[PDB]
């Protein structure tokens, strides 16, 4: 699994379930091209976004729709979404875990990068 | 001053000095128009970005060039930049402090919204 | 002022006001002696804890009563309190800012150490 | 697994390996009694600290020896250790995951609490 996203809720102490995630790749034109999307599971995780063959060198953006998450719990949050932008695989293929820790007015994001 | 940005370095326990910050406002196009920019001071802060008159309701993006900051220190970082996207609403008088705590593979951002 | 404490609420996007803070210094016993205390102001800050003369090298503990803060807001929190334990060293003149960002099931703490 | 600890390194983007963890339980005397200890694995995780039968209601402290971790990498960090203090199982047995995200001058901690 070359790309995995994990989302946690810091108000409830729980995984953040059914959060929409969109992944984009920067194209040769410098536009953001849609690459993959999905929703987190009951464990807060999103697996199966891509394969090693399709996940080439490039600049990628992971967009986490935090606003819809908090609104469905009755909270009006600060941010419109959380965005993570990074260069991937530029020294060969790697495995990436992108984690986000969500509060209404704050978020933290961490990347764990491992060499398979 | 309705909008202030503060950037901190979690590796060195210091303000993050001379970090470039770009602020964008969402246009009718759905495109991001330049709005304000500057470099953080010795205290890690950026003041003077805008005025009460010009800072109307809308969606704003604050982009922090974190990759250039780490490269100056000789540290290879994960993120291309840190982005904070939010709506400004007139709900009484509002001042916005956007803070970012930087590490090479992680960042935290917090918004403090207060009322004079 | 060699030591300042700042506490922020990530649920409400505000300073955390009237939070009790206790500071301890490590004794020869290996025991924690009361050193200073106070309640955070409307800005979430606590100033005036000590003086350059009394703040000698040592190991210090800063205890923030986060559980009482959340209970006042009607939120059931995870932690009994937040603790920050550190050594102070004379390595030139040092000022310490200890910041805590509070959520019900998470907190972040940062130290900014600067030199006048 | 009623209690699991996960430690990540925000400077290197990796699990924090071979970090010492000590767990204490507050005794009837109000002293901290040793409860369990171990070292994180190559995945940054520490499993097998306790069993459901032994993990009774109480106040627990998880102490993560961050200082030794950073010193072995050549960094002189701010904190002596990271401490997490919490009431456990007071409404029946729960499963607890305690995560810590480490930088030299900052750390974040999160708890995920699930009902088996």
Author numbering:
A (entry chain A), B (entry chain B), C (entry chain B), D (entry chain A): 10 to 125
Sentences reproduced from the published study:
Human transthyretin (TTR) is a 55 kDa homotetrameric protein that transports thyroxine (T4) and retinol-binding protein (RBP) in the serum and cerebrospinal fluid. Wild-type (WT) TTR is intrinsically amyloidogenic, and causes amyloid fibril formation in elderly individuals, resulting in senile systemic amyloidosis (SSA). Tetramer dissociation is thought to be the rate-limiting step in amyloid formation. In this paper, native MS, neutron crystallography, and computer simulations have been used to investigate the effects of the T119M and S52P mutations on TTR stability and the molecular determinants of amyloid formation.
The T119M mutation is non-amyloidogenic, and heterozygous individuals carrying the T119M mutation and an amyloidogenic mutation, such as V30M, either remain asymptomatic of FAP or present a more benign form of the disease. In the T119M structure, the longer Met119 side chain extends across the thyroxine-binding channel into a hydrophobic pocket surrounded by residues Leu17, Ala19, Leu110 and Val121. In the WT and the T119M mutant structures, the amide-D and the side-chain hydroxyl of the Ser52 residue form hydrogen bonds with OƔ of Ser50, resulting in a stable CD loop. The distance between amide-N of residue 52 and Cα of Ser50 in the WT and T119M structures is 4.2 Å. However, in contrast to the case for S52P, a large stabilising effect on the tetramers was observed (ΔΔGtetr = −8.9 kcal mol−1; equilibrium constant fold-change of ~3∙106). In addition, the T119M monomers were calculated to be more stable than WT monomers by 1 kcal mol−1 (~5-fold increase in stability), a small but statistically significant effect. The free energy calculations estimated a stabilising effect of 8.9 kcal mol−1 on the tetramer, which corresponds to a change in equilibrium constant of ~3∙106. This effect can be understood in terms of the increased contact area between the two dimers, which stabilises the dimer–dimer interface. T119M-TTR tetramers were found to be highly resistant to dissociation. Finally, the coupling between TTR quaternary structure and the stability of the TTR fold suggested by the simulations indicates that the highly stable T119M-TTR tetramer reduces the probability of the CD strands unfolding. In contrast, the T119M mutation stabilises the dimer–dimer interface as well as TTR’s tertiary structure.
